RNA sequence: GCGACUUUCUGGUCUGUAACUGACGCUGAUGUGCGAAAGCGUGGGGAUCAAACAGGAUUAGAUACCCUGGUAGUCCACGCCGUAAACGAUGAGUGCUAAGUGUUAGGGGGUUUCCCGCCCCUUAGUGCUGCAGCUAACGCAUUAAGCACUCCGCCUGGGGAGUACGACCGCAAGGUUGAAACUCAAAGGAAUUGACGGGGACCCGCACAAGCGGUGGAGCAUGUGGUUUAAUUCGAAGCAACGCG
């Protein structure tokens, strides 16, 4: 029931990195996972000299939404969403609306997106937004 | 008053007279042989 | 412009609505929004947060003759009741009392039956 | 729609038969993408009808069953089984909303 | 059946008093009178509620269940029918039969400075529990379904049917009285096990939720049915057969 840690990163030292690995890790195969993140790495880390961590963590930031709701007929509730379901949301989100972007290399939609919402641009800080939108919207027959 | 009992007195004055139960009871009509059974079979709860 | 700061308000949050009326001290109408005027229906009315809106619009557009010190006055036994006045409150007024209403008859007439 | 009968050759008046009178429920639902009937003889030695079918729905399944002399009565059986069995479950259901708090 | 207030009339009830008459009582066929609600009549009166009904929705359908309005009625008097799960499904009167428990109107007694606090006993009424005893069982159990007495009404398998003919009453709806043919071998009451549930409560489950991945979508192997054959050899079919025998 517990969650299945991961030690660290040994790619900064960090943890969120692999985290996202898992959820691009197709097929198990991390070499091929892990290949086209850190080519990510070095080409955001050109685009707009900057790091990972500052677009990671802004970006990470800016679709993460503090609400989401669910249903229970059905009625859909209000709630302040749990903390790393949000981490997953954000993560989910993120590279599910990242895929759609009609563009043909591993990487470059991706920065594409996380600099969308470095921003506070893109689909994934729009879909925070209208989760916002029900929530305060699903205020009055819910909460 | 500000803010707080304003909201608590007033709901305890109005719990004491039950304007729930007394106008509830008047919302569907009964016949007086069931309205009278269904008192009866209560005085203290 | 009739402009006072001591006004009074009537309610009533029905089972299926919940609505506003500003009166004057004796008084006469000023205002009045309906859950419904605000795109609700149904039950939609009838939740709480319909009265949030309602009761903070016509407290506005009442306040904008200038109205801020009130009495209070609910009947319509309903849900709206007591948070859309913890709306109402943050709606610029400085009520001076809540006087409960409803009204009693005295084994007056008939209700309806079904079910 | 699935029919196989054993020690028995089957014709096509029975068909058209029963899968119409079958096909009269669609006050409800039908919903008919399935029908498995099933059949066999076997003596006693008055010695047999067998009359078995299912029947099945949306999300669930049914059955239906009879043994008979002949045919005619004895597949009013399978109809007039599923009949009831069709109308029950779509009564259910549970509207009576009810606000809340 | 009777619950705003007051007055006018007005019957009845319980206590103690027992001094008065001194067995005058009990039951009660026939009989005569009261009598829910519906209802009929003559008029009046008519706010709500409302069969019928108009319309709307839902259902496959719904003359129904739901919403809106809506008549007769619901209301007053004068009348009339006179019935009912009119049920505590128990006729009335009398007398004895273990406790406990509230509760009502009263009385008497003690207790406290004075009972206002308290208790004791008793009378009538009133409900709950609970022994013998009774009962097919359920239950009853001092307000008996116990024990015994007096009187009245009723019953004799069920369906036929409280229907029919006839008679009485009634404006009419109908009531009361109340058969037989034929038919059946049971109908039925109480209590137990199991079954069911569109009844309830508790629990578990990839049954949910959550998520990931899948099929169906296009091309390839293969089982089945349908086809065909001279042969397409035979079997097994919701899960539990269709990459099986």
Redesign the pocket.
Known sequence: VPKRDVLPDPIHNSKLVTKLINKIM?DGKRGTAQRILYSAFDLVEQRSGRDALEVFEEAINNIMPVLEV??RSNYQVPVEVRPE?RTT?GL?WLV?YARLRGEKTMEDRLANEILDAANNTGGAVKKREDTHKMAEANKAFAH | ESLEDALRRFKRSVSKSGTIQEVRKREF?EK??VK?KKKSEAARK | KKNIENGVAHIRSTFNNTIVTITDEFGNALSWSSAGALGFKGSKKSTPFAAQMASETASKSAMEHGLKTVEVTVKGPGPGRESAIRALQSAGLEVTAIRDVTPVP?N???????? | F???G?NLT?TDAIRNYIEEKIGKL????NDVPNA?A?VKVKTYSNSATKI?V?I?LKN????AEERNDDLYAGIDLINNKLE?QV??????INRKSRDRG
Do not use: M, Q, W
């Not at chain 3, 007056?108 to 079910?115: A, F, L, Q, T, V």
């Not at chain 4, 109308?87 to 259910?92: E, G, M, P, Q």
């Open positions: 197709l669910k249903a379901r949301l989910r599910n | 009509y007086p042989s009278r | 005295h007056g007439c008939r209700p309806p039956k079904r079910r | 699935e029919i196989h054993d089957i669609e006050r409800y639902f498995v099933h078995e299912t099945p669930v399944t049914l059955r009831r109308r029950k479950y779509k009564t259910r």
